Design a binder for these strands. Structure first.
Lengths: 190, 183, 36, 136, 170, 197
RNA sequence: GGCCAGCAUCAGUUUUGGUGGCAGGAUAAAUCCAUAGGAAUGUAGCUUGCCUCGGUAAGUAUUAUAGCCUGUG
RNA sequence: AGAACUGGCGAUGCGGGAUGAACCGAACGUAGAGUUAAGGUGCCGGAAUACACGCUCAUCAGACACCACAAAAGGUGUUAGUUCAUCUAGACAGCCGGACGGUGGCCAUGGAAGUCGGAAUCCGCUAAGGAGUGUGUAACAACUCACCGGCCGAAUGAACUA
RNA sequence: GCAGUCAAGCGUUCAUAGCGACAUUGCUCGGCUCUUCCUAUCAUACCGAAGCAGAAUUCGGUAA
RNA sequence: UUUGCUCCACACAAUAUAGAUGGAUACGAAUAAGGCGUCCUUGUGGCGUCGCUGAACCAUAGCAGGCUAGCAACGGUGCACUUGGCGGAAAGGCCUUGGGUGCUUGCUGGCGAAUUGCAAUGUCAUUUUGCGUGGGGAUAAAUCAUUUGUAUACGACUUAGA
């Protein structure tokens, strides 16, 4: 029905600060900084009291308002990305052949080598995104931990790590072998 | 037939020019990318084959090879090309001041009737401290994204009754254009 | 991809006039069917 | 550690927003948005400027950066009351925009001899300004 | 552009029946002649009469009472379609009844493809009290101290060539 | 008004751009569109690409060396959009086109020269916010053109030199604007004001 | 006295402006003014809640230190 | 398909419909001027990239035409409606909890406790809970929703029409 | 396909002036050779579903 | 080639111009944003200001712009010599260092214009040349014919020979 004014409220905690010109967003805080281009979206930001932010769409159809809420979600995801952080725990299971996951650094690329998956001579190289850090879980068998700031970096890398290990031309029901996101969460629990 | 090899027509010259060149790495040492000679010959070789996985590993293979005659190519110039939205564009060529009888022959269709007055004013253009030659060489080093070498063949050292050598253009895949033009 | 054949929007004069004859045929049917 | 959000700042269409009519019978006169009808149409009246109270498109009009305190649905006399009390006419004349409009109108009604005066005066002003430069 | 007309008719006075009931209605039209024709068209549908059986007694232009006060109108419309005829209630915020029915006719043509001959305007009424205004797109403008901008404005060129690279600020 | 008229075909709209160039000619006005690549169209990428592609599918069946010459270069890509917009088989046409000049990027002596725009073919104005347009640089590349990069490179550098020039300019301007202000209230001055100037 | 022209005052056909007088309608409707009632997206005031000092909020309050609507002239 | 009456073409140029046997306009001597018809006004192309309210985004849109054929529909495209519904005794969404005992109702049968199946499908207790909505175990359990109830605070829901 | 069973609505009001979609229930001139094109693809390429243990396969999607 | 050919100067004829008649007056990017000015914590920074059209800005007064008398200020501009730096995207142009040199309408004087008869583009632009001048500069190849055979219907190609 073409809304005259639609707004959302991005709540800013103490530790972080949000600097926006045009449609480029800083989230500067404890863990680090995050930046995101949004010049595709066509909104208007309003800082009301240095702790609350108001996105705004004037004269927007249902399609434009559908964009309006996703800005609030993405900017908030950057905020929780800096305050709490993101921690994705991937558990890899195998029937017979032991999967051998290691981190190599050829030409400064910081790849993840996935060796011996289902008894396979191919050495799977997964690129590691700029801002995601990989460590292995101590005292828990067969677990790889993905942690950083951006949701896109951590989650897309988690998706990459499990789409290289496709069970090809076989069963789903019989062959359990693969790497899987066991837990999506935050670095600092409260 | 094969529709790629069309139009199936007679070539522009016997010396076909090389259409593409090996890429370029800007850390590699300066080295030539193409060479020329005169193909004439064919002969049989035997060799023991150290090709593992084959039916002829640690066996002997007879095979046909060809002998191209290749006298030592002589450098008589350099070309610099600027990168344009229209392709490449030669802005400056520079020559060797004193060239052989063979290449001054390449510049004429009728050799014997001529006064052989080819690069007389160009060699007289050199005749000082350089000044203009170093100016054109600065012109090449300043601009010109790729640098190709003008060469020719040693036709007299080949048994051919032609006497007339072929000019060519050979790019350099040694990095830093400075090292290209100074080579 | 191999972009497939596009349908024309040029209506030929035989089509256009035949459209008019088919239309007027639908009228004569509709006037008769209105009586029953 | 501040949350600096550059805020794009517009001229909002509101009750008491003074406007300038581009085209029509009025054309170049000021009026005040008395009441907002819908997204495209407003209700305007400038009694001192002489424009009658009318429903107009916002395509026909252009918003000016000045505002004043007007209660909604104000009849002509109330508009004239708040118009004179806020003195939006003198605030209009003070702005660069009214000076630019008056500038074009002054150049339009210039005589040829007056235009020749401008010829001579610009020659004199040029001389002293060119002497003012080539010093620093 | 429209005009409201009070048009009356009383099926021609004959023997034994003097002074019939004078059927009065309000007709929106562009001029007097169209208003008269529309009135006869409506009379033939409201009851069983004809153009030749009656007479236009009075045709009068109804000027709007307060063409300076913004009103909240509610228009009861019915119109012939691709299928059978059907009722419709659209709410229009405008200054005058003529201008409100004008915006309706253009909207009916725009959203429903109905021309002038199809539309039967039943009743145009003022909605006196707000929060009784039913439609949400009209109630959208009845909020307290409504301040909305017009972002992204076009600057109308008088020439073909410009020397600025235009700034669509507001 | 000028002898030549240099258009900055950036963020424009091929169509409305061509059509405003076309007639401009036929009326004998010389014109030189530049920055063609940066030109614009209308509609989600793929859309156009799919479009052109079908055009790139039309060739003289029996001898494709004879049929529709498909041009990539953003220029030509926009010369065909203006061509078929001018009786180009007559003489009055050939004579028209002949005073037209499309350039991908901005070369001399056009660089060091004022360059206009065409409001009626400006995408920003024409188009409605939030509606996919399709730059010209992309389409071109993803269909044959192979000089996207170079230009880019040669364009960035062409700006720099430009920037600096400006800088120098803004300065010398300031200086003159300050001296003038200091020339205010001087009989002569005073007077001019009364005569607007 | 031949070829071509310019201006003026004219006549016929026509195109395009500027300005005056009237007459019609609800003797326009409006606006404006005077009067009598009302509610508000509630106005000044008054009461109240909890705080960044006085802002906001939830009642009253028919305009009082904004105004609006309707009715009659 | 058969009659009647009617136009048009035929013995008829010209304007338009890009093009043309039947489509729209049109009282043909030779010229000048003005005004128009049908059709049009982005450029080709003479004439407004006029004005005003709207609707549409199409992975080959559409410009088309008694709105005629594939045409009845499908669609979590979008905008208008209509008719019934809920709603500050708290609407929709959302999690948190209860979601009961007769009762593992009868036959069935190795094992079938609501959920392999065959028939009724009843009582009580409440705020409300079906001889049970699906997942589940061999059978149970456990979870789920439909039904309520707790914070949450204004709109929302269904079926049709365009 | 014929007849019936439902049956969104419409019938000039409207189910008892009648039409009525998907289902459903009744038994029952031919051939030799080349060029180009189409996809409605047999194989080759990549996918989805399938009691798909592996192998083999069946159906389906993109694909000329 | 009886100094044939090119390049500078002025000189006369010709030849044309899809069409000079003050000036094509250079940031980039964004549009739900920018430009400029100032200031500082030197930043996606504060404060001020601007647009809403180039309706601008720069140039613009002299027999189609003559001749002269000055006054004021170290400016503006033309011309040719000249120090470099810069420009490769079609660079073929852009700034700069200076000496000379006319002119300046910044302001004020004195002469001259007419008869082109009341208008008639009233010719002042820029190409492509040729014949004359008075100075610089530069000292060929190709084809045929013969041969060659890496080529070959003929052409063409590759060769060879003072």
């Amino acid at each position: 029905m073409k809304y005259i004014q639609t707004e959302q409220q991005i709540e800013v905690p103490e530790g972080v600060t949000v600097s926006i010109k045009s449609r480029i967003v800083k989230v500067v805080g404890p863990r680090g900084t995050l930046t995101k281009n949004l010049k595709h979206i066509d909104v208007t930001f309003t800082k009301v009291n240095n702790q609350l932010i108001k996105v705004a769409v004037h004269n927007g159809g249902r399609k434009h308002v559908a964009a309006l809420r996703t800005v609030k979600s993405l900017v908030d995801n950057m905020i929780t990305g800096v305050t709490k952080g993101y921690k994705y725990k991937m558990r890899y299971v195998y029937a017979h052949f032991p999967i051998n996951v290691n981190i190599v650094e050829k030409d400064g690329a910081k790849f993840i080598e996935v060796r011996n998956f289902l008894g396979d001579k191919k050495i799977r190289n997964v690129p590691v995104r700029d801002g995601v850090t990989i460590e292995f879980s101590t005292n828990v068998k067969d677990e790889i931990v993905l942690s950083g700031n951006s949701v896109e970096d951590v989650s897309q890398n988690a998706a990459d790590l499990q789409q290289i290990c496709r069970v090809r031309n076989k069963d789903i029901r019989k062959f359990l072998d693969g790497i899987y996101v066991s837990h999506k969460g935050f670095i600092t629990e409260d | 037939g094969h529709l790629g090899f069309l139009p199936r027509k007679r070539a522009a010259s016997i010396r076909a020019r090389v259409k593409a060149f090996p890429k370029d790495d800007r850390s590699k040492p300066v080295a030539l990318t193409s060479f020329l000679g005169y193909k004439a010959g064919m002969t049989t070789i035997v060799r023991d084959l150290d090709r593992p996985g084959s039916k002829f590993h640690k066996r002997e293979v007879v095979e046909a090879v060809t002998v191209v005659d290749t006298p030592p190519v002589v450098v008589v110039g350099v070309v610099g090309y600027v990168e344009t939205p229209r392709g490449l564009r030669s802005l400056t060529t520079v020559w060797a001041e004193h060239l052989s009888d063979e290449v001054k022959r390449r510049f004429y269709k009728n050799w014997y009737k001529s006064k052989k007055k080819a690069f007389t004013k160009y060699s007289a253009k050199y005749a000082q401290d350089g000044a203009g030659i170093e100016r054109e060489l600065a012109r090449i080093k300043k601009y010109a994204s790729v640098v190709r070498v003008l060469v020719h063949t040693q036709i007299r050292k080949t048994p051919l009754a032609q006497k007339k050598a072929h000019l060519a253009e050979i790019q350099l895949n040694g990095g830093s254009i400075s090292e290209k033009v100074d080579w | 991809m191999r972009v497939r054949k596009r349908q024309s929007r040029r209506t030929s004069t035989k089509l256009k006039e035949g459209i008019k004859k088919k239309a007027s045929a639908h009228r004569k049917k509709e006037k008769k069917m209105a009586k029953k | 550690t501040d949350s600096i959000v550059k805020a794009s700042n517009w001229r909002l269409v509101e009750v008491g927003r003074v406007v300038l009519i581009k085209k029509g019978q009025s054309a170049g006169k000021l009026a005040a948005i008395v009441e907002i009808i819908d997204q495209k149409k407003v209700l305007i009246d400038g009694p001192k400027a002489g424009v009658p109270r009318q429903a107009i498109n916002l395509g026909q009009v252009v918003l000016t950066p000045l505002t004043f305190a007007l209660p909604r649905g104000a009849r002509t006399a109330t508009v004239s009351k708040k118009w004179a009390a806020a003195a939006v006419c003198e605030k209009w004349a003070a702005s660069s925009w009214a000076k630019k409009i008056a500038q074009r109108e002054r150049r339009a009604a210039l005589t040829d001899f007056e235009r020749f005066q401008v010829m001579v005066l610009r020659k004199q002003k040029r001389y002293t300004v060119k002497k003012a430069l080539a010093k620093a | 552009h429209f005009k409201e007309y009070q048009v009356i008719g009383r099926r021609l006075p004959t023997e034994s029946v003097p002074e019939p009931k004078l059927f009065r209605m309000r007709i929106f039209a562009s001029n007097e002649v169209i208003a008269k024709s529309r009135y006869w068209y409506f009379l033939q549908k409201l009851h069983k009469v004809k153009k030749a059986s009656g007479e236009i007694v009075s045709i009068n232009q109804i000027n709007e009472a307060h063409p300076t006060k913004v009103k909240n109108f509610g228009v009861w419309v019915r119109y012939d379609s691709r299928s059978g005829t059907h009722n419709m209630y659209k709410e229009i915020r405008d200054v005058s009844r003529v201008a409100a029915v004008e915006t309706l006719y253009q909207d009916m043509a725009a959203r429903h493809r109905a021309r002038f001959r199809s539309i039967h305007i039943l009743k145009v009424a003022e909605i006196e009290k707000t929060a009784d205004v039913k439609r949400q797109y009209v109630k959208q403008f009845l909020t307290k101290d409504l301040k909305f901008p017009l972002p992204h404005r076009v600057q109308k060129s008088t020439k073909t060539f410009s020397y600025k690279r235009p700034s669509t600020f507001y | 008004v000028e002898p030549v008229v240099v258009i900055d075909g950036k963020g424009h709209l091929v169509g409305r751009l061509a059509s405003v160039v076309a007639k401009q000619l036929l009326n004998g006005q010389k014109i030189v569109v530049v920055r063609a690549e940066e030109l614009n169209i209308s509609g989600e990428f793929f859309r156009n690409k799919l479009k052109y592609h079908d055009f790139l599918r039309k060739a003289t069946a029996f001898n494709k060396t004879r049929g529709p010459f498909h041009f990539r270069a953003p220029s030509r890509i926009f010369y065909k959009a203006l061509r078929g917009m001018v009786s180009h088989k007559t003489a009055r046409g050939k004579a028209a086109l002949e005073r037209l000049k499309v350039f991908e990027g901005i070369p001399p002596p056009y660089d060091k020269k004022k360059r206009v725009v065409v409001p009626q073919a400006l995408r920003v104005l024409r188009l409605k916010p939030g509606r996919k347009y399709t730059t010209l640089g992309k389409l071109s590349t993803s269909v044959g053109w192979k000089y996207e990069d170079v230009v880019a490179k040669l364009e960035a550098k062409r700006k720099v030199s430009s920037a600096e020039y400006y800088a120098k300019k803004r300065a010398f301007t300031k200086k003159v604007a300050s001296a003038n202000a200091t020339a205010a209230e001087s009989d002569v001055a005073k007077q001019l004001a009364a005569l607007g100037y």
